[PDB]
């Protein structure tokens, strides 16, 4: 009989203290989904104050927007490549337990308070380590639902990506030329090329190796503490009413969770109107946001329970449950249903064909023989 | 790690509002009234 586990949504970790995360590897996914351990795709933030006054529209070039394959980008190939590299360099097996992306863990952290999206994830246990990623059939169903999205939503997504293009540079500012700066308005936008950081972090007794998509860095790259100079960008509709603050702080919670996962110290928003025109640009601190929301003068006491600490406790409880429940060489599924919003359901996978397909999607063959020869050496 | 667990227990017992880490929450969800807050604030004894 198949084994099913139910975790109450009210689960909160008592001691979800965060060890300071350290970037142990870095990668740059190319247009062909190939991973190279370099910082070629790392961007550098640059956005002067006076640029806002130009009233730049965020819809120039939306008709030729590019989108990568969701299945291809959901694979854990870069993380496994970095793990193989660090294993070959060290020669000893790492103590890390959980392997994941930033978006998956942001969904797992913001689930109680961002309950308007549905997702299914697959977990594969191999060599005592758990690799989690998206579920391919559900991802295909998501794409099926996606092509029914109106061109307004596509224009909004392209506006966000165009804001990211305009607020970044492909090189450090002293090494950039004028042409690389003023041609960002005509630059083609795609979701394929991106830069990532492979960072070790600690929650309670669990070491998690996260691959976080870094938008850009502050002004340079620090080889000692790479996390301290990282910066990301976001777009949000402007504010004119109380519901506007409510929606903006709901989005702020999600973005703060995303930055807290990868240790981004600073957050930047660009404000857009109904015409997708950039209105304001604001900056916030990751450690100041929990205090900033509670100390607002318009609504001093919205709730007596702090949502951010509860979110962190729920994240820690989810991490601990994932580590404890999953055993060795087991393939499991974690699907969150927004129709229920009551508990998390964890299921086992018994179909050998589907299990092997999920493993191949997560663990490529070449990494399998690399771990096989590592085991033979062991 | 178990020693740090005991340390966190005594820390939450003595101090409630600890920066960067969750406070001890009762079964009803309210924070545990640490002895540090027993003498500070309106609920504190020093104000009266």
């Amino acid at each position: 009989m198949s084994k099913e586990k139910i975790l109450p949504l009210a689960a909160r970790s008592k001691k979800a203290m965060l060890r300071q995360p350290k970037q142990v590897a870095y990668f740059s996914r190319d247009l062909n989904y190939k991973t190279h351990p370099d910082r070629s795709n790392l961007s550098y933030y640059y956005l002067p104050d006076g640029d806002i006054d130009n009233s730049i529209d965020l819809s120039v070039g939306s008709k030729h927007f590019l989108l990568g394959d969701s299945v291809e980008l959901s694979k854990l190939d870069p993380i496994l490549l970095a793990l193989k590299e660090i294993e070959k360099e060290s020669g000893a097996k790492t103590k890390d337990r959980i392997i994941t992306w930033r978006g998956i863990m942001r969904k797992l952290l913001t689930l109680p308070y961002d309950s308007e999206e549905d997702f299914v994830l697959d977990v594969v246990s191999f060599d005592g380590q758990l690799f989690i990623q998206f579920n391919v059939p559900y991802l295909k169903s998501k794409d099926v639902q996606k092509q029914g999205d109106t061109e307004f939503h596509k224009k909004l997504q392209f506006s966000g990506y165009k804001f990211e293009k305009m607020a970044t540079l492909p090189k450090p500012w002293p090494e950039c030329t004028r042409k690389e700066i003023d041609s960002r308005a005509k630059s083609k936008c795609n979701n394929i090329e991106q830069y990532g950081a492979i960072v070790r972090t600690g929650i309670s007794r669990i070491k998690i190796l996260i691959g976080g998509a870094v938008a850009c860095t502050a002004d340079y790259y620090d080889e000692n503490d790479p996390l301290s100079r990282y910066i990301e960008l976001k777009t949000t509709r402007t504010i004119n009413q109380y519901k506007d603050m409510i929606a903006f702080e709901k989005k702020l919670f999600r973005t703060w969770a995303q930055c807290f996962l990868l240790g981004i110290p600073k957050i930047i928003y660009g404000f857009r109107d109904d015409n997708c025109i950039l209105r304001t640009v604001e900056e916030f601190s990751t450690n100041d946001i929990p205090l900033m929301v509670k100390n607002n003068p318009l609504n001093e006491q919205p709730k007596k329970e702090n949502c951010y600490m509860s979110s962190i406790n729920f994240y820690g409880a989810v991490v601990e449950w994932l580590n404890e429940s999953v055993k060795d060489d087991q393939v499991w599924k974690l699907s969150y249903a927004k129709r229920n919003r009551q508990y998390l359901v964890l299921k086992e996978v018994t179909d050998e064909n589907e299990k092997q397909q999920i493993v191949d999607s997560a663990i490529p063959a070449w990494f399998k023989e690399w771990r096989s020869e590592l085991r033979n050496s062991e | 790690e178990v020693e740090q667990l005991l340390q966190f227990h005594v820390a939450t017992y003595m101090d409630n509002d600890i920066a960067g880490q969750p406070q001890a929450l009762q079964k009803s969800g309210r924070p545990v009234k640490a002895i540090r807050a027993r003498l500070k604030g309106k609920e504190g004894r020093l104000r009266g």
Partner: peptide, 22 residues
């Protein structure tokens, strides 16, 4: 430098633990 010729490690507060950097 101390008053012993030994370099003084820097103590950093991670969570509630203290880590030394020699």
């Amino acid at each position: 430098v101390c008053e012993c010729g030994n370099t003084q490690p820097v103590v950093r507060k991670d969570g509630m633990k203290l880590w030394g950097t020699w």
